[PDB]
Amino acid sequence: HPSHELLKENGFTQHVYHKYRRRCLNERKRLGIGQSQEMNTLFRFWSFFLRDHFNKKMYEEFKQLALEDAKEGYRYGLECLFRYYSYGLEKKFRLDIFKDFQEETVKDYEAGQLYGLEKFWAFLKYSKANLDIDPKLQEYLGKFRR
Amino acid sequence: QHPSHELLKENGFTQHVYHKYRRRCLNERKRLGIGQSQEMNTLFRFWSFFLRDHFNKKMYEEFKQLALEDAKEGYRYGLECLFRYYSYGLEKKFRLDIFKDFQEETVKDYEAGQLYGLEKFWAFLKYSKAKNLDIDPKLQEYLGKFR
């Protein structure tokens, strides 16, 4: 499966990927949001690949599509994105993505979900790291733990 | 202070304290609407933890009913708590009837287009020492494509 060849050490080619991505996005369109298991492989691919091989362009598309699916009630993409945030920022902290992590966690919370908040809390527990947390987010974390 | 904490202590559970806490959470759900109640979310989490070592059939059935009602409206916390109760709880103390429920809810979750339940079922199979598991034929198909 291209999903896996591409994650092997130096096994990524921008040719295999383009074909694979094009194919997944087409099944999503053909079958409907949340209906393509192949699209789900791409969400998983992005979640893992971006941790070691950050590509701003891939990342932006990852987030945009995860959120579109989530708006219609299909969580897997967004669940994959929160795992990217939590596990990736642990290994290689970076400030912009951490800011995005906070913003998407707040949005997830205000939409009545807790998946994102638990991932954020878990990140802080395992984080080695001077963190400045959004006031709203500290507030939400406090309530969650009661 | 919050009843959730007290009820989970060793020997901390009483019917009276639980009844008032449950009533309160359900009242907030009825007032704010499905998935709009943070108190209800603490109750889902309580159930998920408490039922592992203090299984109660009537409590479990209400947990499952409310989790599925909420998930229908798109609010998934209750069901996520239920799947964690299934995945972790059955590894610790296997119950055949609950395992059959776990299979049923996983198949439903997958056919509704989610993978949270399937991943938790997968994780249970990876860690369980139970032998001779009879797993739903369609669920085996789904597990196959998944991992």
Residue numbers in the entry:
A (entry chain D): 797 to 925, 927 to 943
B (entry chain A): 796 to 942
Direct quotes from the study:
We have shown that the LARP1-specific DM15 region, a sequence that is highly conserved among LARP1 proteins, but does not appear anywhere else in the proteome, specifically binds the oligopyrimidine-rich sequence present in the 5′TOP of RPS6, but not the 5′TOPs of PABPC1 or RPL13A. The structure of the DM15 region from human LARP1 suggests that its unique amino acid sequence has evolved into three HEAT-like helix-turn-helix folds for RNA binding.
The crystal structure contains four copies of DM15 in the asymmetric unit in two pseudo-dimers; ∼98% of the amino acids are ordered and visible in the experimental map. Superposition of all four copies based on Cα positions yields a range of root-mean-square deviation (RMSD) among six pair-wise permutations of 0.29–0.95 Å, with the majority of the differences appearing within the C-terminus of the construct. Our crystal structure reveals three structural repeats that correspond to three DM15 modules, which we have found to exist in nearly all LARP1 protein sequences. The structure of the DM15 region reveals a positively charged patch containing conserved residues. While it is uncertain that LARP1 exists in the cell as a dimer, the crystallization of the DM15 region as a pseudo-symmetric dimer revealed a positively charged cleft comprised of the concave surfaces of two monomers, which allowed us to hone in on the probable RNA-binding amino acids. Therefore, the position of the co-crystallized sulfate ion, in addition to the pattern of highly conserved hydrogen bonding donors and acceptors lining the patch, were used to position a short polypyrimidine sequence on the concave surface of the monomer. A putative TOS-like sequence appears within the vertebrate LARP1a primary structure in amino acids 928–931, which are contained within the loop connecting α7 and α8 in the crystallized DM15 construct.
